[PDB]
Ligand binder design. Structure first.
Ligand SMILES: Nc1ncnc2c1ncn2[C@@H]1O[C@H](COP(=O)(O)OP(=O)(O)OP(=O)(O)O)[C@@H](O)[C@H]1O
Ligand SMILES: Nc1ncnc2c1ncn2[C@@H]1O[C@H](COP(=O)(O)OP(=O)(O)OP(=O)(O)O)[C@@H](O)[C@H]1O
Ligand SMILES: [Mg+2]
Ligand SMILES: [Mg+2]
Lengths: 390, 54, 242, 385
């Protein structure tokens, strides 16, 4: 033992001695973006960088007095005037403008409100779920195409009838049918700006903090033409009308009332299409599910025994399969199963092909696989309770 | 601009009966309901402001 | 806790909705009534190879021309079988005559109604339940073979054929195609097994199935386990001609 | 013994030589550098001088302007000029302004946070699989969905279809769930994030939803990743008042837990790993299979699995011929694995009190009496109901 004890004392001192000298030397060693084109930029950008073009201390107008009154964002009020050649139409109420750094005078007006920025990170950039991805050829998928896609691609046909085109549509049902799987699909195909919100993103402790948000999001959607504002998971901020008399339901119900007064509006909505993906229409509020704002409402159904024979064609054609797997045969054996569980028979036959050491998933690995996932994921009803009615 | 119409769309934002409350943000909300009732009392030059409320 | 008393502001007694789930859990029970012999067949669902198949009873004799098959918890049913047996024999002391089939259903349905709060001295000897269905089948002079469907609701209808239990949905859709008005006894007996095979968890054998009929001359008669093994064997010949 | 030291000396002849060579060629051997590196460092430094004032980018304009806000306060409408790439400019980012005329002289700023410290882990566990050995096939389902599509891209392209996602660990306590997770993060050597589910409930209200949206943006960046939510049952009782818990705080955590793991977001690779001992309180929108694929079920091991389990813990202890290893296992009649581990920590605690440094047959049969008395004193049934 003793010959090797004297070698455990070196291993301890030595691994840390090395370690400090190597990380300080390596450093970021002077790596700063720009690279090879920024040397030609140095000719152009040195005569402008010295100009006072910048800085313009950004301010914001509080009163046009038929001259102009700005309020700096430091709190100190000044009366300024026109610039080099700006039109007197540019200066509007509550608009930000840049003013000369020294003696204050409007040089260049600037777009409005610096509260938008928590609302530009909610906008996604063309999802990859395509439009044939969704199961069946149901008539319910064409109703999504008759409320959103069709009146914006051709407003010629809804102008001859005379009808106000239906603008809303509600997607509701049991989970696993794709409420978000068909709202991604429709964001790929329509090429209209999609604006996803999380309805449980608004909540904070400081009341009417989600009032600011809801306002500015609603304006940001008003400016771009053809938009779709997809509110997911509005069971929080979309609850029943009640009044506990003692809790903190008072913060919660602020953000809903502000959601109500913009939807209908003094100034109607201007080419905004409305989607709601809810789990339940059962607790949802009586002022949101009241029909001018919902228009036409299509509940997405549990696929029938023909709807699962259709769906089973999307997941078994992409796997490598021997020829002659009747898609009716595995759909029968299965009980009443969503399409999110009918996707998991392919994945459990794919993990059993690897165990059995097969390069092909066959009709034998799918018969076993059914038995395992139907038992397994059926047993134990999550909470196996729920209720909370009486 | 008196007489003029202030139209309040909704009124359940400040119209809580609850202003005897026990640790809630009703102590900030209720402060804009009571500044209402003072700016609704008679002191003339407000005898000519009306109100709709839905 | 919900009352038995309370209403759901839809208009519904919560408890009835929960009872009608318990049917569906229990084992499959098919009945096909024709003009030549009512056939009742059920799936036993033997739960271990140790347990003896034939002790289990889910085809039950009410009298000697009213046979009955039950689905759901077999315990709940122990009380309601006994009540039905007495009443049919009571009538046979009292009018020396076969109890109508329809009438017997009504008396079962009446006990089913009972589950009440049990206010004052009033006798409601249950406080709960009766989560089981019956396929009450019979023959009498007034109407030919009949078949009736009892619920725990206190609600019954006549039916030309009705499935109930786990595979009720599937069995229902095959019945609306296959049922006819020209079926023979021998064709109905083979047809019941074919619809019972699809929704049987296990392979169709007579060690998890029991067949019975009621036919005018015989009365009630449950089949031999030897006969049934032979009708299984003949189904697969006709199917293997196709 | 010798194996270890040959390699440790082999990496201290590499570290020594490389540091002397790489220091000498930055301070003496300059030819591909030399003139061209002395001109580039001289141009960028002179042009922006110093001090440089760090700012925060609220928004970009595409004509080469930005609105930056100092953190002190005074806002500025600055210019994007020279020695800057717009690939890294975007909201939240830290830029360098010139302290007189503020022009964005470049972006290189990322300043670590004590909120991204608590989430990210520095650990490298000192146990690897087969110190969990036993319940053998329960770590051979978590290796089919965590390790195996990273290691062989081949097999999951060959069958096609989408790969599995996630797992839930639930079952009897004393079945090792916590060390099972601490082993699937050490094998793979992927970026293992780790959060207890009880930090998601805080006295602050609506601070829940901001904290777990943060957790998933950090996770998406370092992807491929494994997230441990250890104890997601804990969200079911822990609460400080009735509104910092109650329906209010529990719905905020669900909603959040629902968006991160499957939403419109179109999440990159976060594998999720949850430890738990409550399955009948979870969201029914997660034990929806097809978020979370194969769930793992654990029970108390049987007598031959508990022979493999007691052999991992007893090599640690001093070994004798006297020791009766097989008879501690037999007597226990489906008793968990957290007790087997409380009995070998109890054998060296009796051994130290004596100041006898051998663990023999006597110290293990004494330590089993102390382990069966605490769990049996807490059984106040006495005469069996
Ligand atoms: N109709 C369908 N056809 C093909 N696949 C489907 C369908 N419905 C669901 N899926 C599959 O199941 C996956 C998960 O379902 P999804 O997450 O869309 O459920 P959800 O409807 O949004 O439920 P919830 O929002 O309450 O959790 C999808 O990514 C998709 O692979
Ligand atoms: N089946 C097993 N094989 C090998 N070791 C085991 C086994 N079960 C338990 N152990 C040992 O017991 C120790 C204590 O386990 P740990 O604290 O991780 O258990 P747990 O089941 O996670 O407990 P809890 O029920 O409190 O969540 C483990 O760290 C592990 O070494
Ligand atoms: Mg959804
Ligand atoms: Mg643990």
């Amino acid at each position: 033992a003793a010959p090797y004890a004297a070698k455990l004392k070196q291993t301890e001192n030595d691994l840390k001695d090395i370690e400090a000298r190597i990380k300080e030397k390596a450093g970021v060693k002077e790596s700063d973006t720009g690279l090879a084109p920024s040397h030609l930029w140095d000719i152009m950008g040195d005569r402008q960088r010295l100009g006072e073009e910048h800085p313009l201390q950004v301010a914001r107008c509080t009163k046009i007095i038929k001259k102009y009154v700005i309020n700096l964002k430091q709190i100190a009020k000044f009366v300024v005037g026109l610039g080099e050649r700006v039109s007197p139409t540019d200066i509007e109420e509550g608009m930000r403008v840049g003013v000369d750094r020294s003696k204050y005078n409007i040089e260049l007006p600037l777009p409005p409100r610096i509260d938008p920025s928590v609302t530009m990170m909610t906008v996604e950039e063309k999802p990859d779920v395509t439009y044939s991805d969704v199961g069946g050829c149901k008539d319910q998928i064409e109703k999504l195409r008759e409320v959103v896609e069709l009146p914006l691609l051709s407003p010629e046909r809804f102008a001859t009838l005379g009808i106000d085109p239906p603008k809303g549509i509600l997607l509701y049902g049991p989970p696993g049918t794709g409420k978000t799987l068909c709202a991604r699909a429709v964001a790929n195909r329509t090429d209209a700006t999609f604006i996803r919100v999380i309805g449980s993103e608004l909540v904070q402790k400081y009341v009417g903090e989600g009032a600011r948000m809801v306002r500015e999001l609603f304006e940001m959607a008003r400016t771009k033409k053809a938009c779709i504002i997809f509110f997911d998971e509005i069971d929080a901020v979309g609850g029943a009308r009640f009044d506990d008399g003692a809790g903190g339901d008072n913060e919660v119900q602020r953000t809903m009332l502000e959601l109500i007064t913009q939807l209908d509006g003094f100034d109607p909505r201007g080419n905004i299409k409305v989607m709601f993906a809810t789990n339940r229409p059962n607790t949802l509020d009586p002022a949101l599910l009241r029909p001018g704002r919902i228009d036409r409402k299509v509940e997405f159904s549990l696929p029938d025994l023909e709807g699962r024979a259709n769906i089973f064609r999307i997941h078994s054609k992409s796997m490598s399969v021997e020829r002659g797997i009747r898609w009716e045969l595995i759909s029968r054996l299965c009980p009443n199963s969503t399409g999110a569980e009918l996707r998991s028979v392919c994945t459990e036959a794919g993990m059993f092909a690897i165990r059995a050491r097969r390069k092909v998933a066959t009709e034998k690995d799918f018969l076993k696989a059914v038995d395992k996932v139907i038992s397994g994921y059926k047993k134990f009803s999550s909470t196996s309770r729920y209720m909370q009615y009486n | 601009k008196a007489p003029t119409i202030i139209f309040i769309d909704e009124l359940d934002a400040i119209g809580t009966k609850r202003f005897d409350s026990e640790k809630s943000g009703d102590r900030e909300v209720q402060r804009t309901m009571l500044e209402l009732l003072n700016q609704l009392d008679g002191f003339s030059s407000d005898d000519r402001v009306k109100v709709l409320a839905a | 806790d919900r009352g038995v008393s309370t209403f759901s502001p839809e208009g519904r007694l919560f408890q009835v909705e929960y009872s009608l789930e318990a049917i569906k859990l229990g084992s499959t029970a098919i009945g096909i009534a024709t003009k030549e012999g009512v056939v009742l067949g059920v799936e036993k669902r033997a739960t271990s190879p140790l347990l003896e198949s034939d002790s289990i009873e889910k085809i039950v004799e009410i009298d000697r021309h009213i046979g009955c098959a039950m689905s759901g918890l077999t315990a709940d049913a122990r009380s309601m079988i006994e009540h039905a047996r007495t009443a049919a024999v009571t009538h046979n002391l009292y009018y020396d005559e076969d109890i109508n089939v329809e009438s017997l259903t009504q008396s079962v349905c009446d006990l089913a109604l009972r589950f009440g709060e049990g206010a004052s001295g009033e006798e409601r000897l249950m406080s709960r339940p009766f989560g089981v269905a019956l396929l009450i089948a019979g023959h009498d002079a007034d109407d030919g073979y009949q078949l009736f469907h009892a619920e725990p609701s206190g609600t019954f209808y006549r039916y030309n054929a009705k499935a109930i239990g786990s595979g009720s949905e599937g069995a229902q859709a095959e019945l609306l195609n296959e049922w006819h008005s020209s079926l023979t006894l021998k064709e109905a007996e083979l047809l019941v097994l074919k619809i019972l095979k699809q929704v049987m968890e296990e392979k169709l054998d007579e060690n998890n199935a029991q067949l019975s009929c009621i036919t005018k001359q015989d009365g009630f008669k449950i089949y031999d386990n030897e006969k049934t093994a032979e009708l299984i064997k003949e189904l697969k010949e006709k199917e293997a001609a196709e | 013994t010798r194996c270890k030291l040959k390699l440790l000396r082999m990496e201290r002849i590499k570290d020594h030589l490389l540091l002397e060579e790489e220091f000498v060629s930055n301070s003496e051997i300059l030819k591909p550098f030399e003139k061209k590196q002395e001109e580039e460092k001289k141009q960028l430094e002179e042009i922006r001088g110093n001090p440089l004032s760090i700012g925060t980018l609220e928004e970009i304009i595409d004509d080469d302007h930005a609105i930056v806000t100092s953190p002190t306060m005074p806002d500025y409408y600055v210019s994007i000029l020279s020695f800057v790439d717009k690939e890294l400019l975007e909201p939240g980012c830290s830029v360098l302004l010139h302290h007189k005329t503020m022009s964005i002289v470049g972006v290189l700023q990322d300043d670590a946070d004590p909120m991204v410290s608590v989430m990210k882990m520095d650990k490298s566990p000192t146990e690897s699989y087969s110190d969990i050995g036993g319940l053998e096939s329960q770590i051979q389902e978590i290796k089919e969905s965590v390790e195996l599509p990273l290691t062989h891209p081949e097999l999951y392209e060959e069958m096609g279809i989408k790969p599995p996602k996630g797992v839930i660990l639930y079952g009897a306590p004393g079945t090792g769930k916590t060390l099972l997770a601490k082993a699937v993060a050490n094998q793979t050597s992927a970026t293992f994030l780790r959060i207890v589910g009880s930090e998601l409930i805080q006295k602050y209200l609506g601070d829940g939803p901001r904290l777990c949206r943060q957790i998933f943006k950090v996770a998406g960046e370092n992807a491929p990743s494994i997230v441990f939510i250890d104890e997601i049952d804990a969200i079911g009782t822990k609460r400080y008042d009735s509104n910092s818990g109650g329906e209010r705080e529990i719905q905020r955590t669900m909603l959040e837990l629902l968006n991160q793991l499957d939403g419109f977001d179109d999440r990159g690779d976060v594998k999720v790993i949850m430890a738990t001992n409550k399955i009948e309180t979870l969201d029914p929108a997660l034990i929806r299979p097809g978020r979370i694929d194969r769930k793992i079920l654990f029970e108390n091991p049987d007598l031959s699995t508990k022979k493999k389990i007691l052999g991992i813990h007893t090599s640690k202890m001093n070994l004798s011929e006297d020791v009766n290893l097989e008879t501690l296992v037999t007597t226990k009649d489906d008793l968990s694995g957290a007790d087997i581990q409380a009995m070998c920590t109890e054998a060296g605690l009796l051994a130290l009190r004596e100041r006898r440094m051998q663990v023999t047959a006597e110290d293990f049969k004494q330590a089993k009496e102390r382990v069966m008395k605490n769990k049996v004193e807490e059984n106040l049934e006495g005469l069996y109901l």
